[PDB]
Amino acid sequence: GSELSERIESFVETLKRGGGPRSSEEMARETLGLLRQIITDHRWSNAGELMELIRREGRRMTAAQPSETTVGNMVRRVLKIIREEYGRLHGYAQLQSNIIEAINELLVELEGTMENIAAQALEHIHSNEVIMTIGFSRTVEAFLKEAARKRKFHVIVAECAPFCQGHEMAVNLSKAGIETTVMTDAAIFAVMSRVNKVIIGTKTILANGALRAVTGTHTLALAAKHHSTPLIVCAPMFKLSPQFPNEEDSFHKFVAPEEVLPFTEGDILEKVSVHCPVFDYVPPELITLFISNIGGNAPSYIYRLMSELYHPDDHVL
Template identity: 40%
Template sequence: MVVGNIVRRVLGLIREEAEDGREAEFCLSSDAGTDTQPHTPPAVESHATLHPPSLSTHGPHGGTRGASLLSRSEGRDADWERGTNSSVRSETMERSSSRPPMVSYGSFATTTTEPPVVSMFRLLSYPQVESPQARSPGNASPSGRTRGQFALKDFKAEVIDGIGEIVDELSQVEDQIASYALEHIHSDEVILTYTSSVTVHKFLSKAAAKRKFTVIHAESYPNSHRETHAVVAGRPPARSGDEENLSPESFQKSLTELGVTVILIPDSAVFALMSRVNKVILGTHSVLANGGLVSEAGTRAIANAAKVHKIPVIVVSGIYKLSPVYPFDYESLIEYGDSSAVLPYEAGDLEKIDVENPLYDYVPAELVDLYITNLGGHAPSYLYRIVSDHYRKEDIAF
């Protein structure tokens, strides 16, 4: 499951960079299709004459203003007529200058040469006419891009950098978890642990540098008991197990040199000694999105005993072990090993009996009190938030 988690994170990284690339391409296409020159509204065509109208101009009622004035001036002498005509002409010029010019529009059925308005947000604005400067060769770069456009990021380089960050996280995760040890382990405490995990070892070693405490180590029969026996006896055998487990020699040597007393007990004595334990610190194979975990076979029995005695259970694990999978069928998460570890083949054929050797146990979230990761301590109910921050929904199911 850990390999699947790393693959999901790499897929999420690739999807994120691909989305950023699409957004950049969209910006480039938008900049290429939009004229950056300021647009001025086109001049409105008008058939009205802007100079002052003469006396022969038609009035609003269809009659001629000049004819009416001439009819009124009949019977008068020429001097008085010239004076009247000059005063009427000046009054007409003042009125025409105060009125806006009359604009004549063509029929709505006729087609215009202006481009149509294509956006509903520009219905009240003038249509943008392409500027002849936008097509001038001076605004184009030698690579074919117009000025103001930016180059897309190197997709491959970004993905490689992201993978490098994940690799750095994996190399530092145990040390980051160990930095929280002094906050949870105090002097003269009795701590029960199970298996010889690298993460648990560094966590205990960091606290042992400044605190004195006792470690009770359950033997974890039948799959890891030989390695556990070697831890206490100081006789490390050749290992062929999980790479995440530390060699018994390193585990035992570093803790005893730091003044930690390591006591080996059989699995059957866990419940009897749980009342003397201050806290349980466990490693894990993987952590599920609901707060449960998959760990070495026998872990659930220890967690159940701790719950009965009200002993806090602390699980140390890196974020890379946190899986977005929900245990709808937790039995499918349990792997089975060689049954001869439980009942040797030398015992002969046995009828009407099936021998099973589960390698892992599923521990529900209600049996765990605290998870300590490289991001700090978290309650089991908070893990869903960390899952949503590290994985994408489309990558949960392969």
């Protein structure tokens, strides 16, 4: 049925224009949902045609919004899954159900990724600690909230400056008696001297471990490498991607400059070329320890996960 085209186009449109959803994992699951819908309801002879088709829709879905790359690496992982199924059926008839059950098992693993990471938490934290976290990510909120039922500590969250989501995260955390304190972002280094380990979220984790976080993190990662306190990058294994740092500044996402300098100012808005990015690169040499849905990792080792998750060839997509 041609309702598949409607799913595709509505997905694309709600990808470009508005932010939906908020939990990135929900975008992951609905990317996989649309992908299953694609990978049944369309005609193909061999798996080659299916790979070509998936790469076509993936190119469109990524050039749609190249900063929100969750969906891009989801398309890449589904391409890896079809490659695996073709290998198992080759060393043209029934691989469809195999691919579908593999995608289903992938969705199964994706449901409980926050619970995996939560279960992992209680080890890395210790009592009477002082953690800092930037912005608001659901993974970190779980990680802190559920592992604060056994051990009491503090968390110095920093209100991110363009969109003070740190406020929402701080209220969510302090609705669990966790002692969250909200500092304006500017004063990160003012207290990055009394912080025992920093736990940041992410939006991606490039091939070499260089994450890409809510703006105001490269400052946090530098102010950590200064005092040599370790960044704990709580980040599920679908927030990875085989892209490498070079992205011709489509890397960042450049939101409407109405956030920093409001349109209600005056004439000074004709000369001033206001900037407001939201995503900051973080080099792999300040990160200490990733927390994937399989376990802890050292930043370097991240590259290996790539060769075991996304096929090396389909990185151009």
